[PDB]
């Protein structure tokens, strides 16, 4: 079980060592395209790139590069696109990717400003009456409605392909209290947010892969994706003990480097999966406990 293992690691204080072992074992694949000179201004961080084999290619002839990876969890049968926070020059690419990949959901785990520094472009409209138009990729984006909670906000956006004039609803889930290189305030508030995304249909197989990002797209994004997949695996078999959290993380790291950035984030993942297992194993009421414990109201 995760619990037994969690307490063994906890009792000896081996999280840093456990986490370092994962770093050491992680896949190392080429990122030749991300490192091309022409793509320099398309990367937010020098040391965070998508592998060539799993990168999302934009469907344009000019330059198909974007810092984004497709994480295809074969056994869990769920896919995620993890990407960096868009730069001022890549917002059009970001939405082009959303359109071409047929995504319904965008999960954002960072704030535009964190620790006094700018971490992400303002890539979506904050006012209904001020829609955005990305001239390079011929897309229009409109804020349709906003539901503001205490530590997250849900937005309904309308994305229009100006070329074909067809439109789509995009759901934007914005977690506003998850510090960079940090952990959520609680398993409860994190799980409450995760289940809000799930309940929107954004994670369903009839849609393209959900887009998950923070600033770099590996730490908080990794943490979010890891928990979700572990709970999905457990759900499929109704067998908590069949899930090897570290193996899953390692499987995810075949598709994008550096997923989960700290030992504490790893520790949190265990917590979130362990708490979430109560819901998966038949205690439907625990979801309401999370909502309360999370204090989303206000
Ligand atoms: O902006 V993230 O450092 O949690 O990859």
Query: What CA–CA distance (Å, rounded) separates 222 from 218?
Result: 5
What approach was used to elucidate this structure? X-ray
Determine contact, residues 170/103, Cβ cutoff 8 Å: yes
φ, ψ of residue 221 to 5 degrees: the values are -55, -45
Query: What CA–CA distance (Å, rounded) separates 207 from 200?
Result: 11
Is residue 284 classed exposed, middle or buried when 0-12, 13-18 and 19+ CB atoms within 10 A define those classes?
Answer: exposed
φ, ψ of residue 41 to 5 degrees: the values are -80, 10
φ, ψ of residue 129 to 5 degrees: the values are -80, 0
Q: Residue 220: name the closest of 259, 264, 173, 267 by CA.
A: 259
Token duo for residue 203: 């994670």
Q: Residue 95: name the closest of 133, 130, 127, 63 by CA.
A: 133
Among 175, 216, 253, 259, name the best residue to mutate to test ligand 1's pocket (greatest count of ligand atoms within 8 A of Cβ): 216
Determine contact, residues 71/252, Cβ cutoff 8 Å: yes
Distances (CA, A) of 206 to 79, 138, 214, 251: 12, 25, 25, 24
Query: What CA–CA distance (Å, rounded) separates 284 from 49?
Result: 40
3-state SS track over the chain: CHHHHHHHHHHHCCHHHHHHHHHHHCCCCCCCCCCCHHHHHHCCCCCCCCCHHHECCCCCCCCCCCCEEEEEECCCCEEEEEECCCCCCCHHHHHHHHHHCCECEEEECCCCEECCEECCCCCCCCCCCCCEEECCCCEEEEEEEEEECCCEEEEEEEEEECCCCCEEEEEEEEECCCCCCCCCCCHHHHHHHHHHHHHCCCCCCCCECEEEECCCCCCHHHHHHHHHHHHHHHHHHCCHHHCCHHHHHHHHCCCCCCCCCCHHHHHHHHHHHHHHHHHHCCCCCHHHHHHHHHCCCC
DSSP bridge partners of 74: none
Q: Residue 112 CB: number of other CB atoms within 10 A?
A: 16
Positions marked active-site: 214
φ, ψ of residue 176 to 5 degrees: the values are -105, 0
Gyration radius of the chain over CA positions: 19
269 lines ligand 1 (CB under 6 A): no
- Binding-site members for substrate are 180, 214-220, 261
> Which CATH number belongs to the domain containing residue 27 in this structure?
3.90.190.10
Ligand 1 atom with least separation from CA of 220: 4
Ligand 1 atom with least separation from CA of 222: 5
Distance 214 CA to ligand 1 centre (A): 5
Q: Residue 261 CB: number of other CB atoms within 10 A?
A: 22
DSSP bridge partners of 131: none
Ligand 1 atom with least separation from CA of 110: 1
Ligand 1 atom with least separation from CA of 223: 4
Report resolution in angstroms. Answer: 2.2
Determine contact, residues 48/178, Cβ cutoff 8 Å: no
- Residue found under tokens 């072992």: 21
- Residue found under tokens 């439109």: 167
23-55 b/e with 16+ CB inside 10 Å = b? eeebeebebebbeeeeeeebbbeeebbbbeebb
184 lines ligand 1 (CB under 6 A): no
Query: What CA–CA distance (Å, rounded) separates 128 from 111?
Result: 20
Q: Is 62 left (phi over 0), alpha (psi -120 to 50) or beta?
A: alpha
> Whole domain around residue 235: which residue ranges?
1-298
Dihedral of the alpha carbons of 147, 225, 263, 94, in degrees to the nearest 10: -70
Query: What CA–CA distance (Å, rounded) separates 208 from 159?
Result: 15
- Enumerate residues 6+ apart whose C-beta is below 8 A from 134: 91, 92, 95, 96, 140, 141
Determine contact, residues 85/214, Cβ cutoff 8 Å: yes
Length of the chain: 298
Distances (CA, A) of 101 to 39, 80, 292: 21, 11, 35
Distance 201 CA to ligand 1 centre (A): 25
213 lines ligand 1 (CB under 6 A): no
Token duo for residue 11: 């009792």
Domain count, the chain: 1
Query: What CA–CA distance (Å, rounded) separates 12 from 273?
Result: 21
Q: Residue 184: name the closest of 220, 138, 226 by CA.
A: 220
Is residue 254 classed exposed, middle or buried when 0-12, 13-18 and 19+ CB atoms within 10 A define those classes?
Answer: middle
Distance 119 CA to ligand 1 centre (A): 9
280 lines ligand 1 (CB under 6 A): no
Query: What CA–CA distance (Å, rounded) separates 110 from 170?
Result: 18
Angle of helix 263-280 relative to helix 245-252, nearest 10 degrees? 120
Is residue 153 classed exposed, middle or buried when 0-12, 13-18 and 19+ CB atoms within 10 A define those classes?
Answer: middle
265 lines ligand 1 (CB under 6 A): no
Distances (CA, A) of 75 to 28, 181, 237: 22, 29, 11
Distance 258 CA to ligand 1 centre (A): 10
């Amino acid at each position: 079980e995760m619990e037994k293992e969690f307490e063994q690691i906890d009792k000896s204080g081996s999280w840093a060592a456990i986490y370092q072992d994962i770093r050491h074992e992680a896949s190392d694949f080429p990122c030749r395209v991300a490192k091309l000179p022409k793509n320099k201004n398309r990367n937010r961080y020098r040391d965070v790139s998508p592998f060539d084999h799993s990168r999302i290619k934009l469907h344009q002839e000019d330059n198909d590069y974007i810092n984004a990876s497709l994480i295809k969890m074969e056994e869990a049968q769920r896919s995620y696109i993890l990407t960096q926070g868009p730069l001022p020059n890549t917002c059009g690419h970001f939405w082009e990717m959303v359109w071409e990949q047929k995504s319904r959901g965008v999960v954002m785990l960072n704030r535009v400003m964190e620790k006094g520094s700018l971490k992400c472009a303002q890539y979506w409209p904050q006012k209904e009456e001020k829609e955005m138009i990305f001239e390079d990729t011929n897309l229009k984006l409109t804020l349709i409605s906003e539901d503001i909670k205490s530590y997250y906000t849900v937005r309904q956006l309308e994305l229009e392909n100006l070329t074909t004039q067809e439109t789509r609803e995009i759901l934007h889930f914005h977690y506003t209290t998850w510090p960079d290189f940090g952990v959520p305030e609680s398993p409860a508030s994190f799980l409450n947010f995760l289940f809000k995304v799930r309940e929107s249909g954004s994670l369903s197989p009839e849609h393209g892969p959900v887009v998950v990002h923070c600033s770099a797209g590996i730490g908080r994004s990794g943490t979010f994706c890891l928990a979700d997949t572990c709970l999905l695996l457990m759900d499929k078999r109704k067998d908590p003990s069949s899930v090897d959290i570290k193996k899953v993380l390692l499987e995810m790291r075949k598709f994008r480097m550096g997923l989960i950035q700290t030992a504490d984030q790893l520790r949190f993942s265990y917590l979130a999966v362990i708490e979430g297992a109560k819901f998966i194993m038949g205690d439907s009421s625990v979801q309401d406990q999370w909502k309360e414990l999370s204090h989303e109201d206000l």
